[PDB]
Amino acid sequence: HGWVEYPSARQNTCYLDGGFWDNTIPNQACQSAFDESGAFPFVQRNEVAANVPNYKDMAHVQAIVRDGNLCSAGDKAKSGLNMGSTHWQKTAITLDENNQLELVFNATAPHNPSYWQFYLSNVNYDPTVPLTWGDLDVVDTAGDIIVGDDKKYRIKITLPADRADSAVLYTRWQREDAAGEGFYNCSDIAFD
Ligand SMILES: [Cu+2]
């Protein structure tokens, strides 16, 4: 259980902006998600999750987390997260001298053994259309990472230095257990 804290996952930004209990939501993409799903996806910021027992087989992953449902990890109760918008708030990204950023994943329930896959929407992706697997390229992977003493995972990832547009970073954190729990988060970013 957890979420991408930096660059903040979509549902985490919605949550931390607040307003959804008293009709003061500040952002119009956050409002539209709320209109479709209510507060559930925001208060459940740490369980954007799907179980894939055959987790090493991407054909099995894509049968469970289906095109147009990646940001909700296939949960219809979180479907508002998947809506296309020009107004999703973006984290401005400047890569370090090695073309990296430190991704920070805040875990309420650390899980090991596990592994990580990082995907990036391609330059032809239209943010007004829900994300599909065909929109994504794998940019980096990680193995079993020990959680910090502050219950955050820190992972240096390499991103392309040729990008200057807005994109979705798609983080997959996969447990290596019988049930095959995995956590799927979309992070809206603006390369600058
Ligand atoms: Cu968990």
Author numbering: 26 to 217
Q: What did the original publication write about this model?
A:
The A. salmonicida LFI1238 genome harbors genes encoding two family AA10 LPMOs (AsLPMO10A, AsLPMO10B) and one chitinase GH18 (AsChi18A). LPMOs were discovered in 2010, and thus represent a recent addition to the chitin degradation machinery. These copper-dependent, redox enzymes cleave chitin chains by an oxidative reaction and synergize with chitinases in chitin degradation reactions. Can it be that the two LPMOs have different functions? Both A. salmonicida LPMOs cleave chitin chains by oxidation and contribute to chitin catabolism. In conclusion, we have shown that the LPMOs of A. salmonicida may be moonlighting enzymes that not only contribute to chitin catabolism, but also play a role in the pathogenicity of the bacterium in the invasive phase of CWV in Atlantic salmon.
A structural investigation of AsLPMO10B was initiated to find a rationale for its apparent role as a facilitator during host invasion. AsLPMO10B carries the canonical fibronectin-like/immunoglobulin-like β-sandwich core structure found in other LPMOs, consisting of seven β-strands arranged as two juxtaposing β-sheets. The β-sandwich supports the histidine brace catalytic motif (His26, His136) and the putative co-substrate coordinating amino acid (Glu206), which shows conformational heterogeneity and was modeled in two alternative conformations. The histidine brace is loaded with a copper ion, as confirmed by anomalous scattering, an expected consequence of the sample preparation process. Copper shows an incomplete square planar coordination, hinting at the presence of Cu (I) at the metal-binding site. The latter is likely a consequence of the well-documented photoreduction of Cu (II) during X-ray data collection. We also observe electron density “above” the copper site, where the putative ligand would bind, which may represent a citrate molecule from the buffer. In particular, the distinctive loop 2 (L2) of subcluster 2 is conserved in AsLPMO10B. Tma12 has been proven to shield its host from predators by exerting an entomotoxic activity. Their structural superposition reveals a possible site for AsLMPO10B O-linked glycosylation at Thr166, matching the N-linked glycosylation of Tma12 at Asn158. Moreover, we note the structural similarity of the AsLPMO10B AA10 domain with the chitin-active AA10-domain of viral fusolin, an LPMO that strongly enhances the infectivity of entomopoxviruses, indicating shared structural features that enable an LPMO to enhance the virulence of a pathogen.
